[PDB]
């Protein structure tokens, strides 16, 4: 439960 990383998919 966190914002996805910049490297995370769509």
């Amino acid at each position: 439960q966190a914002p996805a990383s910049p490297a995370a998919p769509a």
Partner: antibody
Amino acid sequence: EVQLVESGGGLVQPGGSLKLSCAASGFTFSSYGMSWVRQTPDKRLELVATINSNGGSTYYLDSVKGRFTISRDKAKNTLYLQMSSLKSEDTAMYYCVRGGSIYDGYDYAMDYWGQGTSVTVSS
Amino acid sequence: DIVLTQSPASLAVSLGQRATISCRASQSVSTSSYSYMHWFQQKPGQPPKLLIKYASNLESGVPARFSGSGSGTDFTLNIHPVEEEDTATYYCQHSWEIPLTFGAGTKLEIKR
């Protein structure tokens, strides 16, 4: 209390087929991405497949692409892993896991694991 | 793909003392706000259990003797004071990118 109960594992012939089931309770199933993680006899953990909360996004381990399908049924709060063209390398304990989804701008950790269902690929 | 390297493979820690387990990622898994590293405990005959999420967040209901730290490539799991029930294999896992991967595990023996 979160509960994840796997079934459908067991002995299956090389080239054969099984469908694993995971009954989820104690949370709003549709709100969570879900994963299958396997543990091989060497005790290594490897993520096999992930499905996002709604079912529109799926990930597969390269070595199971075209062999395995992850799906979910909102009616039954049930997660599935269809396993086809089974190989010796697929012998493992298969865990149903809440989370492991980094889709849709949100990261949800692998916070609940079932007791697991055993698969043995052998003639 | 990211590779996670744990060290050591195994260790024995006297009852009441500190166990320190390391995980190194092949590339950074941190922004300036979040580190995408997690820690699991696998007790004998049990599935993995989440201890720490996003490097330093104690998983709700997990005892305070467990803590996580680190940023970029280098992460630590600290257990202090160790107790008998802490005998287990411990794993790290990142959620930086597809694919999600695990370290190969560190076996903790409690020394009595």
